[PDB]
Amino acid sequence: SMEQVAMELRLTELTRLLRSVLDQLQDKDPARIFAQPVSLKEVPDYLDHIKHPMDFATMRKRLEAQGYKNLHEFEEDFDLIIDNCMKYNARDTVFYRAAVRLRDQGGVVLRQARREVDSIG
């Protein structure tokens, strides 16, 4: 149908905007701490601690399959990245500190993303 196509164009355009958001958030992680999944070879107990692992490569795979229906879903995944790190790692670690800085800096990006998603519809 023509309606299914219009819906699909909307999803494509959301995906475009989320790709730009993702790039901007990942720039706030210049150490690449959150770039890839935590390795279960190197942290074999990880899934005992963290039930829903997340990282920027995994988000990128979902995004490119147009697997985010709305900004809420995307933000859920970004908050997992941060929240998983802040639980597994202690306050005095470069990992925790990286997550705090990513959260604080990403907030600004996500605030305007929400306005753009609402504004453009």
Q: To which residue do tokens 């164009």 refer?
A: 9
Resolution of this entry, Å: 1.5
Domain containing residue 95: CATH number: 1.20.920.10
Task: Count Cβ atoms below 10 Å from residue 2 Cβ, excluding itself.
Answer: 6
Angle subtended at Cα 111 by Cα 109 and Cα 107, rounded to the nearest 5 degrees = 55
Method by which the coordinates were obtained: X-ray
Give the domain extent around 13.
Answer: 1-121
* CB of 72 closer than 8 Å to CB of 7: no
Nearest to 59 by CA among 34, 32, 84: 34
Q: Crossing angle for the helix pair 2-27 and 71-88, nearest 10 degrees? A: 30
13, two tokens: 């355009």
CA distance 38 to 44: 10
Question: Which pair of structure tokens corresponds to residue 49?
Answer: 């601690």
- How many structural domains compose the chain? 1
